[PDB]
Structure formats: structure tokens, C-alpha cells
Design an enzyme around this catalytic site. Structure first.
Site, mmCIF file in Angstrom:
data_model
loop_
_atom_site.group_PDB
_atom_site.id
_atom_site.type_symbol
_atom_site.label_atom_id
_atom_site.label_comp_id
_atom_site.label_asym_id
_atom_site.label_seq_id
_atom_site.Cartn_x
_atom_site.Cartn_y
_atom_site.Cartn_z
ATOM 1 N N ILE A 119 22.271 -1.006 18.371
ATOM 2 C CA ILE A 119 22.219 -1.790 17.116
ATOM 3 C C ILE A 119 21.624 -3.199 17.389
ATOM 4 O O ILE A 119 21.757 -3.715 18.507
ATOM 5 C CB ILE A 119 23.594 -1.880 16.385
ATOM 6 N N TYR A 141 25.162 -1.087 11.176
ATOM 7 C CA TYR A 141 24.821 0.188 10.522
ATOM 8 C C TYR A 141 24.503 0.099 8.992
ATOM 9 O O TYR A 141 24.195 1.127 8.376
ATOM 10 C CB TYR A 141 25.922 1.240 10.792
ATOM 11 N N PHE A 166 33.074 -6.195 18.796
ATOM 12 C CA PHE A 166 32.714 -5.619 20.091
ATOM 13 C C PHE A 166 33.167 -6.490 21.265
ATOM 14 O O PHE A 166 33.104 -7.720 21.190
ATOM 15 C CB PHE A 166 31.194 -5.392 20.189
#
Length: 412
Positions: free
Chosen positions: A75, A101, A118
């Protein structure tokens, strides 16, 4: 708690500055060097949603997550994020759907318009190995544009900066021909790498001993034998060479005369790598041709035969005995009783310890010309070196089966 921490005290690392990727350093790391575009990156990670639920992980140390940076393999937020990390660093990332996303998500795991948390640990990073031999390592500074890449024989316009042990010996704009960089004091590694570059691309090239100036060194630049070099290359523009099928017979025969002469200049100066490139063009252009006139066929076959005999000579000098044999096989398929082709095949097979095959080639030489002095001296050399080789094999076999049996008896 750590999601609220990055939301509050998060460093914005986006170009547009929209708080799309917010970062916080958990563990510092070491080195100052950060991963570049095209680098092979090794990581450990955890992924969480807004509610705090774990969607993905790879921390187990059974296997880390391996991918190429700045290529769209991960990503957008990772391609931006990981590029800012030092080796051994642990960071936290708050990612907006625009850098993750989006509105589609990745159902059922990632919902629509999801802000992702993350935890990333950068284990290791290596540059790209162009020919999988550790010879040319590429680190991309700026991505290029375009459909095509330069081919061998193409003309290029580059900016070049070259260093040896930190000392700069070259800094200039240079126009040259791919395969012929040596004419402008450029090592072969640059020519080989250009075939893998796009127009406007800027990169760093680490040239190992096989791809630099070699054993002779480069006295005018103060470069010692087999020294490692580091270059910065910008490909400004290029004009590709015509492919084999884009040339008519008349053009192929005119260019064959030109590159045969250029190959011979390189051979006389001991630039065998460069002579191979020139004589190889003749083979590429004329091996598969047909439908030629009587006059065109005779000239084409003549060029073809000399190019194979010359390539075999280059390969004996380069100590590439298998390539030497292959070139003699092609020559002998054109001319069955060629004296030069048979002798050179014998020399290369003898050097590869194929004593019986070598004996045969030197015998056929004497069938062609019984006045050949060297041919008879080499048959005795095949005889002498085959006996010496068998005595050696018998000694090793007896020593190994003495070693193996003594270690076997020691076990029991």
C-alpha cells in the site's frame, strides 16, 4: 493507547501534507542509510483496525515479509513509510484509506474507508542485483519514463560520476555507443546496466571486479587492478540500434565490413571482451539469412566463417573454452575441413581435459595438412596429460576411500 499516541504526536511524511501517513519512532535503529526505490526490503509487522482488532501479522521470525520498495507491491503508506526508516528501526503508522485500500477496502478483512494502524520493524535492505552474480548492484534515485530501454549498439547521452574508494576520478556528460564505452574510458558494467534503464532514470551502480576496468587497472584515473567502483548515472536520451530483421541484405553486408575491422582493432589491443561484441553482430545479422543472390550468399558465408573462427580465438584468450568449442562447431558446419576450426577445437578440448576428443581434432588437422608441425606435438601432449590425469584420479580415489574407511572403523 498507541493508536491515539500516533494520532496526537504523529509526524506527517506526505508530499501534499494531508496527515494521510502519520509516523512515530518506537525504536531508533542505526546507520543513517534508508531504503531506496527498487531495494529488496526485509520487515516484521502487525496490522490493526480502528476498533483495535488484529487483521494481519508477521513477527514469528520463522520468515520475515520480503518485497521491493517503491514499486506498488505494498500500500502507498508503506512505500512512503518504509523509505524513511533506518536499519533495525521500529515505527508506528496511522494510514488514511487514500494511502491504503480506499472505498473498496479488501473484504472481508479490510472494510470500506478504513484508517489502518501498523507496527513495522525494518530488519534488512539490499540493492537490486542486475545479473544475479553480485557484480552490478543498482540503487534507484529517480524513476525514468518510457516503453523502451537502450539495446547493444544504441547511441546514448548520459551524465556520469565515478568514484574509487571515495575518491572521484570522473564527472562529465558523455555521448557514446552501448558495447563501446571503452572508446570513452567507461567500464563494461555501465554498458550492461544501461540496457536495464529508462529515459530520465537516475541511479547508483556498484561495480564488482568483473564489471570494472579489470586486471590491467586504469592508470590515467589512478585505478588499481580489479578495484571496486561506485557510479552515478543519469540517462538523458538514447536512439536504439536497428534489430537484425529491420536491416536489408545490402546494409547488413556494408555494416559487416565495418564491425569486422572494429573487432580486429580491439583484438590487436587485447580488448577481447569488446572484440566479441563486434564479431557477434556479424553472426546475429547473417546466420539465419536465405533467399540471397549468388554474389550476396558467397560474401555472407565468407563473413560468417571468419566471424566464428575469430570468436573462437577471442574465447581461447578469455579462457572460455566451452564457447570456443561452440564457435568451432559452427565454423566446421560451414567448412567441414577448415584447418583453423579443427586446431582451435583441439586446443579448447585439451584445456577442458577432453583428451580423446582433442586427439581426434588434431588428427583431422594432419589429414587436411600433413605439413602441420604443431598438430603432431599436441597429440603427444594429449597422451602425456591423459596418463597424468588418470594417475591423479587413482591417487585421490585411493586416498578418499582410505579416509572414508578409516573414519568408518573409528565410528565402530
Amino acid at each position: 493507547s498507541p493508536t491515539a499516541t500516533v494520532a496526537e504526536q504523529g509526524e506527517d511524511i506526505t508530499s501534499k501534507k494531508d496527515r494521510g501517513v502519520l509516523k512515530i519512532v518506537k525504536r531508533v535503529g542505526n546507520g543513517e542509510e534508508t531504503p531506496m526505490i527498487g531495494d529488496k526490503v526485509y520487515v516484521h509487522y502487525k496490522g490493526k483496525l480502528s476498533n483495535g482488532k488484529k487483521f494481519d501479522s508477521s513477527h514469528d521470525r520463522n520468515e520475515p515479509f520480503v518485497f521491493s520498495l517503491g514499486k506498488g507491491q505494498v500500500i502507498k503508506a508503506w512505500d512512503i513509510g518504509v523509505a524513511t526508516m533506518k536499519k533495525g528501526e521500529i515505527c508506528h503508522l496511522l494510514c488514511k484509506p487514500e494511502y491504503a485500500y480506499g472505498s473498496a477496502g479488501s473484504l472481508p478483512k479490510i472494510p470500506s474507508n478504513a484508517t489502518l494502524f501498523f507496527e513495522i520493524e525494518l530488519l534488512d535492505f539490499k540493492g537490486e542485483d542486475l545479473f544475479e552474480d553480485g557484480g552490478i548492484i543498482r540503487r534507484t534515485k529517480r524513476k525514468g519514463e518510457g516503453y523502451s530501454n537502450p539495446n547493444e549498439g544504441a547511441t546514448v547521452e548520459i551524465h556520469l560520476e565515478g568514484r574509487c574508494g571515495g575518491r572521484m576520478f570522473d564527472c562529465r556528460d558523455v555521448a557514446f555507443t552501448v558495447g563501446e564505452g571503452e572508446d570513452h574510458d567507461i567500464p563494461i558494467g555501465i554498458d550492461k546496466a544501461l540496457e536495464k534503464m529508462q529515459r530520465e532514470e537516475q541511479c547508483i551502480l556498484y561495480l564488482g571486479p568483473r564489471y570494472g576496468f579489470g586486471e590491467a587497472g586504469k592508470p590515467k584515473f589512478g585505478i588499481e587492478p580489479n578495484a571496486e567502483l561506485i557510479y552515478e548515472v543519469t540517462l538523458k536520451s538514447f536512439e536504439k540500434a536497428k534489430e537484425s530483421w529491420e536491416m536489408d541484405t545490402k546494409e547488413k553486408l556494408e555494416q559487416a565490413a565495418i564491425v569486422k575491422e572494429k573487432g580486429t582493432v580491439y583484438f590487436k589491443g587485447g580488448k577481447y571482451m569488446q572484440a566479441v561484441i563486434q564479431y557477434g553482430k556479424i553472426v546475429s545479422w547473417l546466420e539465419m539469412e536465405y533467399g540471397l543472390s549468388e554474389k550476396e550468399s558467397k560474401a555472407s558465408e565468407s563473413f560468417l566463417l571468419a566471424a566464428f573462427l575469430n570468436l573462437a580465438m577471442c574465447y581461447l584468450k578469455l579462457r572460455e573454452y566451452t564457447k570456443a568449442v561452440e564457435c568451432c562447431d559452427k565454423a566446421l558446419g560451414l567448412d567441414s575441413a577448415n584447418e583453423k576450426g579443427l586446431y582451435r577445437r583441439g586446443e579448447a578440448q585439451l584445456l577442458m581435459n577432453e583428451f580423446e576428443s582433442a586427439k581426434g581434432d588434431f588428427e583431422k588437422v594432419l589429414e587436411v595438412n600433413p605439413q602441420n608441425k604443431a598438430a603432431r606435438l599436441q597429440i603427444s601432449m594429449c597422451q602425456k596429460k591423459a596418463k597424468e590425469h588418470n594417475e591423479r584420479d587413482r591417487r585421490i580415489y585411493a586416498n578418499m576411500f582410505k579416509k572414508f574407511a578409516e573414519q568408518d572403523a573409528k565410528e565402530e
